[PDB]
Amino acid sequence: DALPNTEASGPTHSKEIPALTAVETGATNPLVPSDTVQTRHVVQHRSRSESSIESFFARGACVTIMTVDNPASTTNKDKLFAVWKITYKDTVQLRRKLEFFTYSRFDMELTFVVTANFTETNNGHALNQVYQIMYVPPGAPVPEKWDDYTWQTSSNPSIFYTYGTAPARISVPYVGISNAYSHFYDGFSKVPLKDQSAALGDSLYGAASLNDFGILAVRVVNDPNPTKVTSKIRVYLKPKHIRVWCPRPPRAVAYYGPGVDYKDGTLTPLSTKDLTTY
């Protein structure tokens, strides 16, 4: 869209005094440059398209790193499959971009980038591996062994990624039970009633099952080789069709956990600067 044209202006002697206002009310001054300065006509070409919500969020961001290994059958140590609870609060950048706003409805697009590497000094051979990435919604059984029944994916959607091909990718609609994702929640999930044990009803502040999306379990389908092979799946999350509500002030101090807590020594964001110094 073509932003408003900067209309011309000239000397004035009126008493409207648009320059002076009162900030006590909650309305910002709509004053424009033409009002307080002699302004020349200017055809306007600049557009705010790049700064829209989509263009501001139309970029995948890493949200986790999941480590899965394929220990050699020589060593009795069991395989390590990675169970990562779905959330965007593991990192900071995506979390900080989202926590500008209070509520958000956005379809999601997840991309999995896998990498592998040998660990034992023995430069052995490992055939191309196949990774299973299974989504376990809230309630579905959590796999406990890399080769148990739960991996059948009878109802849990799953992706089989052949290492070395294009990174895996899948889209998901808005899955919130509420009508918008709650970035912040001031409240509890239980109310401690006056006539029950203290332990009962004790729930973490600002913790609710609105952000309860289940887990994501990643395993190496290949049965173990003679040489251990480690791998690290990276999940990049892109919000599509995103709508946001109730803006907020961006975080200033480093995050501390899922909540809005801040650590003791992190409360010094600003920098030294003398009052009268350009």
């Binding site: 009162a22 900030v23 006590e24 009310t25 909650g26 309305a27 139309a58 209070t102 509520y103 379809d107 999601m108 889209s171 609609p173 919130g176 509420s178 009508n179 918008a180 994702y181 709650s182 970035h183 912040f184 929640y185 001031d186 409240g187 509890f188 109310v191 401690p192 009633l193 006056k194 006539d195 203290a198 009803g201 004790d202 973490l204 502040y205 600002g206 913790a207 599509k240 069709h241 509500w245 109730c246 803006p247 907020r248 002030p249 961006p250 975080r251 200033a252 101090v253 995050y255 501390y256 956990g257 899922p258 909540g259 809005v260 807590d261 801040y262 650590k263 003791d264 409360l267 964001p269």
Partner: protein, 281 residues
Amino acid sequence: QVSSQTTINYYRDSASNAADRVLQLTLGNSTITAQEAANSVVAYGRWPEYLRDSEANPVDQPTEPEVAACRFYTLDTVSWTKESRGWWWKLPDALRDMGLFGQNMYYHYLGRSGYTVHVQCNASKFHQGALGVFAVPEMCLAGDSNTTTMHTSYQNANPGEKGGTFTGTFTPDNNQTSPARRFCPVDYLLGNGTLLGNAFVFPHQIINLRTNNCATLVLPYVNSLSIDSMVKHNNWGIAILPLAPLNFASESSPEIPITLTIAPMCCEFNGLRNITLPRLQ
């Protein structure tokens, strides 16, 4: 579809697609007047409205108290001494022991409501100061323990009408045996961890003692849910912070009182049952 600068959708599911001084207001049997109030802020430009069936989740017939609950309750008064950092009251947790609104919200399971907050503080022409009243939505606050997160208790996170206060400097709750589980929001960080300067993004007004002595905020019902439990979730939150400290005639002990008058508007309830008797002390 050939869009301007060929867009073909191959997947059935949609997620797979590509990207002024004078004021007098009457609520029920309550009336508020203010001859030097600098207009009102309709937070987000949305007047409170009753739930519309087009976006109605529950089925039960809603009980709207109307006059009996949409009244102006005056919460306790607080002294704005020179060395005071601020105050914060969470809503509707403040109106939990106020008239019939408290009874309705405790009896009914689900409840929604807008509010009209009138902050009153008057000083002489010779007084010097300025308050900022922000209606923070989903107002969270940081805990006091660096060894745990989201550990605050229900009793301490819901002070009631007494409200809370902002502390000048952070102080960890070093007690590892019986943690206080108490909010410790730093004044300039606003508690959430953000900066105070940016806090003006929230709906807000300023009570500048030279110009105006009142601040009116019409807060609609904002929430991810059309209707939600009032005993668990505190939708809004009022934070009053003094932008410029109080001063008067070179006197080092000037005090003036600040009062709040909150009026629920278009408050609706559903899900009646035994009355909630929560543990608060």
